[PDB]
Structure 1
Amino acid sequence: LLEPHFCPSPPALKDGFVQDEGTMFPVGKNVVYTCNEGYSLIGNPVARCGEDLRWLVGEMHCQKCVLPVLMDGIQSHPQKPFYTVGEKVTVSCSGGMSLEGPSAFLCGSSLKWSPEMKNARCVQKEN
Structure 2
Amino acid sequence: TGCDDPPRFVSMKPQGTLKPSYSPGEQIVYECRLGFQPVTPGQVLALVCQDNNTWSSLQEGCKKRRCPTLADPTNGQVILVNGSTAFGSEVHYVCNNGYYLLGTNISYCEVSSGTGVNWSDNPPTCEKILCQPPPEIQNGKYTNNHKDVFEYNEVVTYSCDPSNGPDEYSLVGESKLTCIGNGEWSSQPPQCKVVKCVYPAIEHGTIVSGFGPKYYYKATVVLKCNEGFNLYGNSVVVCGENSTWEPELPKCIK
Q: Where does residue 114 of structure 1 map in the other structure?
A: 187
Q: Deviations along 1:55-91, whole A, 9 cap, x unmatched?
A: 2249x77464642113474222465624773745033
- Separation of aligned partners in 1, 2:171 and 2:158: 13
Q: Where does residue 9 of structure 2 map in the other structure?
A: 3
Residues 1:70 and 2:136 are matched in the alignment: yes
User: Within 5 A, what are the aligned runs for 1:42-121?
Assistant: 45-52=105-112, 53-57=117-121, 62=126, 64=129, 66-71=132-137, 73-77=139-143, 79=145, 81=147, 82=150, 85=153, 87=155, 89-96=157-164, 98=169, 101-102=172-173, 104-110=175-181, 111-116=184-189
Aligned residues: 119
Q: 1:83 to 1:73 in 2, by over 3 A?
A: farther
Indicate the larger mover: 29-38 or 78-87.
78-87
Residues 1:17 and 2:83 are matched in the alignment: no
Q: Deviations along 1:76-108, whole A, 9 cap, x unmatched?
A: 246562477374503324523525522512325
Q: 1:114 to 1:71 in 2, by over 3 A?
A: closer
Q: 1:44 to 1:79 in 2, by over 3 A?
A: closer
Q: 1:70 to 1:48 in 2, by over 3 A?
A: same
Extract unaligned runs of 5+ from structure 1.
none
For residue 94 of structure 2, the aligned residue among 21, 31, 34 is 34
Asked if the contact 1:105–1:115 (Cα under 8 Å) also holds between the matched residues in 2, the reply is: no
Superposition CA RMSD, Å: 4.1
Q: 1:115 to 1:10 in 2, by over 3 A?
A: same
Greater radius of gyration (CA)? 2
Q: 1:49 to 1:73 in 2, by over 3 A?
A: same
Q: Deviations along 1:13-50, whole A, 9 cap, x unmatched?
A: 56332134xxx932112112232243356987321011
TM-score in terms of structure 1 length: 0.57
Identity %: 18
- Separation of aligned partners in 1, 2:163 and 2:108: 61
- Separation of aligned partners in 2, 1:44 and 1:50: 15
Asked if the contact 2:178–2:186 (Cα under 8 Å) also holds between the matched residues in 1, the reply is: yes
| Bigger relative CO (Cα 8 Å, ≥ 6 apart) | 1
